[PDB]
Amino acid sequence: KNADNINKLKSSIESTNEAVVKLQETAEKTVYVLTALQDYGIDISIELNKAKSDLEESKEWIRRSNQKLDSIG
Amino acid sequence: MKNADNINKLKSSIESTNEAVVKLQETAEKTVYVLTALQDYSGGSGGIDISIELNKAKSDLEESKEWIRRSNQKLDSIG
Amino acid sequence: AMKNADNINKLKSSIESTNEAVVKLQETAEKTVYVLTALDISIELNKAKSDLEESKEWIRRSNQKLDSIG
Protein backbone atom coordinates (compact mmCIF):
# COMPACT_ATOMS: atom_id res chain seq x y z
CA LYS A 1 0.00 0.00 0.00
CA ASN A 2 2.66 2.57 1.01
CA ALA A 3 4.79 1.78 -2.06
CA ASP A 4 1.83 2.30 -4.44
CA ASN A 5 1.01 5.57 -2.70
CA ILE A 6 4.64 6.75 -2.93
CA ASN A 7 4.46 6.10 -6.70
CA LYS A 8 1.16 8.10 -6.91
CA LEU A 9 2.74 10.99 -4.95
CA LYS A 10 5.69 10.96 -7.34
CA SER A 11 3.38 11.21 -10.39
CA SER A 12 1.36 14.00 -8.71
CA ILE A 13 4.46 16.13 -8.15
CA GLU A 14 5.61 15.48 -11.72
CA SER A 15 2.28 16.88 -12.92
CA THR A 16 2.42 19.79 -10.51
CA ASN A 17 5.96 20.53 -11.81
CA GLU A 18 4.60 20.58 -15.39
CA ALA A 19 1.93 23.12 -14.30
CA VAL A 20 4.68 25.27 -12.73
CA VAL A 21 6.79 25.04 -15.94
CA LYS A 22 3.79 26.18 -18.05
CA LEU A 23 3.18 29.00 -15.61
CA GLN A 24 6.86 30.01 -15.92
CA GLU A 25 6.32 30.19 -19.68
CA THR A 26 3.26 32.40 -19.13
CA ALA A 27 5.34 34.64 -16.86
CA GLU A 28 8.11 34.95 -19.53
CA LYS A 29 5.55 36.25 -22.01
CA THR A 30 3.85 38.63 -19.59
CA VAL A 31 7.27 40.11 -18.71
CA TYR A 32 8.14 40.41 -22.42
CA VAL A 33 4.87 42.26 -23.07
CA LEU A 34 5.35 44.66 -20.14
CA THR A 35 8.91 45.37 -21.32
CA ALA A 36 7.66 46.04 -24.85
CA LEU A 37 5.03 48.49 -23.57
CA GLN A 38 7.63 50.62 -21.71
CA ASP A 39 8.28 54.28 -22.43
CA TYR A 40 11.58 54.65 -24.31
CA GLY A 41 10.51 54.55 -16.37
CA ILE A 42 13.94 53.83 -14.85
CA ASP A 43 12.22 52.23 -11.83
CA ILE A 44 9.94 49.96 -13.92
CA SER A 45 13.06 48.82 -15.82
CA ILE A 46 14.69 47.84 -12.50
CA GLU A 47 11.60 45.94 -11.31
CA LEU A 48 11.21 44.08 -14.62
CA ASN A 49 14.83 42.96 -14.45
CA LYS A 50 14.29 41.66 -10.91
CA ALA A 51 11.22 39.72 -12.16
CA LYS A 52 13.38 38.18 -14.87
CA SER A 53 15.94 37.02 -12.28
CA ASP A 54 13.19 35.58 -10.04
CA LEU A 55 11.81 33.70 -13.04
CA GLU A 56 15.22 32.22 -13.87
CA GLU A 57 15.58 31.06 -10.25
CA SER A 58 12.09 29.55 -10.43
CA LYS A 59 13.33 27.50 -13.40
CA GLU A 60 16.40 26.27 -11.47
CA TRP A 61 14.25 25.16 -8.53
CA ILE A 62 11.85 23.19 -10.74
CA ARG A 63 14.82 21.43 -12.37
CA ARG A 64 16.04 20.58 -8.87
CA SER A 65 12.66 19.10 -7.98
CA ASN A 66 12.47 17.08 -11.20
CA GLN A 67 15.97 15.72 -10.64
CA LYS A 68 15.06 14.73 -7.08
CA LEU A 69 11.95 12.88 -8.35
CA ASP A 70 14.06 11.08 -10.95
CA SER A 71 16.17 9.62 -8.11
CA ILE A 72 13.14 7.79 -6.70
CA GLY A 73 13.29 4.13 -7.74
CA MET B 1 2.59 4.20 11.67
CA LYS B 2 5.53 6.31 10.46
CA ASN B 3 5.54 5.84 6.67
CA ALA B 4 1.75 5.81 6.31
CA ASP B 5 1.48 9.00 8.40
CA ASN B 6 4.18 10.75 6.38
CA ILE B 7 2.45 9.77 3.12
CA ASN B 8 -0.71 11.49 4.47
CA LYS B 9 1.33 14.60 5.27
CA LEU B 10 2.96 14.55 1.79
CA LYS B 11 -0.51 14.34 0.21
CA SER B 12 -1.70 17.35 2.27
CA SER B 13 1.44 19.32 1.31
CA ILE B 14 1.00 18.74 -2.43
CA GLU B 15 -2.73 19.59 -2.19
CA SER B 16 -1.77 22.94 -0.60
CA THR B 17 0.98 23.61 -3.16
CA ASN B 18 -1.48 22.77 -5.97
CA GLU B 19 -3.93 25.32 -4.57
CA ALA B 20 -1.06 27.85 -4.41
CA VAL B 21 -0.52 27.15 -8.12
CA VAL B 22 -4.26 27.56 -8.82
CA LYS B 23 -4.36 31.00 -7.10
CA LEU B 24 -1.25 32.07 -9.06
CA GLN B 25 -2.91 30.86 -12.27
CA GLU B 26 -5.81 33.19 -11.39
CA THR B 27 -3.32 36.06 -10.89
CA ALA B 28 -1.84 35.21 -14.33
CA GLU B 29 -5.27 35.08 -16.02
CA LYS B 30 -6.18 38.54 -14.69
CA THR B 31 -2.81 39.95 -15.75
CA VAL B 32 -3.05 38.61 -19.33
CA TYR B 33 -6.69 39.81 -19.41
CA VAL B 34 -5.74 43.34 -18.40
CA LEU B 35 -2.95 43.39 -20.99
CA THR B 36 -5.04 41.82 -23.79
CA ALA B 37 -7.88 44.29 -23.12
CA LEU B 38 -5.47 47.26 -23.26
CA GLN B 39 -3.86 46.05 -26.49
CA ASP B 40 -7.20 45.15 -28.13
CA TYR B 41 -8.85 48.43 -27.07
CA SER B 42 -6.16 50.42 -28.89
CA GLY B 43 -5.16 49.28 -32.33
CA GLY B 44 -2.56 46.57 -31.96
CA SER B 45 -0.77 49.80 -31.01
CA GLY B 46 1.98 47.87 -29.20
CA GLY B 47 2.65 45.76 -32.30
CA ILE B 48 1.33 42.43 -33.53
CA ASP B 49 4.06 40.57 -31.60
CA ILE B 50 2.41 41.69 -28.32
CA SER B 51 -0.91 40.18 -29.37
CA ILE B 52 0.78 36.91 -30.45
CA GLU B 53 2.71 36.58 -27.17
CA LEU B 54 -0.43 37.33 -25.15
CA ASN B 55 -2.26 34.62 -27.11
CA LYS B 56 0.58 32.17 -26.42
CA ALA B 57 0.50 33.11 -22.71
CA LYS B 58 -3.21 32.23 -22.60
CA SER B 59 -2.50 28.79 -24.14
CA ASP B 60 0.34 28.22 -21.67
CA LEU B 61 -2.03 29.02 -18.81
CA GLU B 62 -4.68 26.58 -20.13
CA GLU B 63 -1.97 23.91 -20.21
CA SER B 64 -0.88 24.81 -16.65
CA LYS B 65 -4.50 24.52 -15.48
CA GLU B 66 -4.82 21.04 -17.06
CA TRP B 67 -1.60 19.83 -15.40
CA ILE B 68 -3.06 20.84 -11.99
CA ARG B 69 -6.26 18.91 -12.76
CA ARG B 70 -4.07 15.89 -13.55
CA SER B 71 -2.10 16.27 -10.32
CA ASN B 72 -5.28 16.62 -8.24
CA GLN B 73 -6.83 13.59 -9.97
CA LYS B 74 -3.75 11.53 -9.03
CA LEU B 75 -3.87 12.68 -5.40
CA ASP B 76 -7.55 11.80 -5.27
CA SER B 77 -6.63 8.16 -6.04
CA ILE B 78 -4.48 7.98 -2.90
CA GLY B 79 -6.18 6.25 0.01
CA ALA C 1 10.76 0.21 6.64
CA MET C 2 13.82 2.01 5.29
CA LYS C 3 13.38 1.97 1.48
CA ASN C 4 9.94 3.59 1.62
CA ALA C 5 11.24 5.97 4.35
CA ASP C 6 14.04 7.10 2.03
CA ASN C 7 11.64 7.68 -0.87
CA ILE C 8 9.39 9.66 1.48
CA ASN C 9 12.40 11.88 2.32
CA LYS C 10 13.05 12.31 -1.42
CA LEU C 11 9.39 13.20 -2.04
CA LYS C 12 9.65 15.73 0.78
CA SER C 13 12.77 17.37 -0.70
CA SER C 14 11.16 17.45 -4.16
CA ILE C 15 8.01 19.23 -2.87
CA GLU C 16 10.23 21.69 -0.94
CA SER C 17 12.05 22.50 -4.23
CA THR C 18 8.71 22.85 -6.08
CA ASN C 19 7.54 25.23 -3.35
CA GLU C 20 10.75 27.29 -3.80
CA ALA C 21 9.92 27.50 -7.55
CA VAL C 22 6.37 28.67 -6.75
CA VAL C 23 7.65 31.31 -4.26
CA LYS C 24 9.98 32.60 -6.98
CA LEU C 25 6.98 32.83 -9.34
CA GLN C 26 5.03 34.66 -6.64
CA GLU C 27 7.88 37.18 -6.47
CA THR C 28 7.78 37.69 -10.24
CA ALA C 29 3.95 38.10 -10.04
CA GLU C 30 4.41 40.78 -7.34
CA LYS C 31 6.69 42.80 -9.61
CA THR C 32 4.53 42.41 -12.73
CA VAL C 33 1.36 43.48 -10.90
CA TYR C 34 3.24 46.46 -9.46
CA VAL C 35 4.59 47.41 -12.93
CA LEU C 36 1.16 46.91 -14.55
CA THR C 37 -0.31 49.38 -12.05
CA ALA C 38 2.47 51.97 -12.56
CA LEU C 39 1.86 51.82 -16.34
CA ASP C 40 -12.34 48.26 -14.02
CA ILE C 41 -8.61 47.66 -14.61
CA SER C 42 -8.19 48.67 -10.96
CA ILE C 43 -10.79 46.04 -9.96
CA GLU C 44 -9.07 43.30 -11.98
CA LEU C 45 -5.61 44.16 -10.59
CA ASN C 46 -7.03 44.20 -7.06
CA LYS C 47 -8.42 40.69 -7.61
CA ALA C 48 -5.03 39.60 -8.99
CA LYS C 49 -3.28 40.99 -5.88
CA SER C 50 -5.86 39.21 -3.70
CA ASP C 51 -5.26 35.86 -5.45
CA LEU C 52 -1.48 36.41 -5.12
CA GLU C 53 -1.64 37.04 -1.38
CA GLU C 54 -3.74 33.86 -0.98
CA SER C 55 -1.23 31.93 -3.11
CA LYS C 56 1.47 32.93 -0.63
CA GLU C 57 -0.64 31.60 2.22
CA TRP C 58 -1.15 28.21 0.56
CA ILE C 59 2.67 27.76 0.24
CA ARG C 60 3.04 28.63 3.91
CA ARG C 61 0.48 25.92 4.68
CA SER C 62 2.33 23.45 2.43
CA ASN C 63 5.66 24.25 4.15
CA GLN C 64 4.01 23.80 7.57
CA LYS C 65 2.80 20.33 6.56
CA LEU C 66 6.27 19.38 5.22
CA ASP C 67 7.83 20.56 8.50
CA SER C 68 5.64 18.09 10.39
CA ILE C 69 7.27 15.19 8.52
CA GLY C 70 9.71 13.36 10.80
UniProtKB/Swiss-Prot annotation, chain C:
Coiled coil: 1-27
Maturation and modification: The inactive precursor F0 is glycosylated and proteolytically cleaved into F1 and F2 to be functionally active. The cleavage is mediated by cellular proteases during the transport and maturation of the polypeptide.
Intracellular or extracellular location(s): Virion membrane; Host cell membrane
Protein name: Fusion glycoprotein F0
Assigned protein family: Belongs to the paramyxoviruses fusion glycoprotein family.
Complexes and interactors: Homotrimer; disulfide-linked F1-F2. Interacts with the Glycoprotein G; this interaction involves both head and stalk regions of glygoprotein G. In pre-fusion state, found as a dimer of trimer.
Function summary: Class I viral fusion protein. Under the current model, the protein has at least 3 conformational states: pre-fusion native state, pre-hairpin intermediate state, and post-fusion hairpin state. During viral and plasma cell membrane fusion, the heptad repeat (HR) regions assume a trimer-of-hairpins structure, positioning the fusion peptide in close proximity to the C-terminal region of the ectodomain. The formation of this structure appears to drive apposition and subsequent fusion of viral and plasma cell membranes.
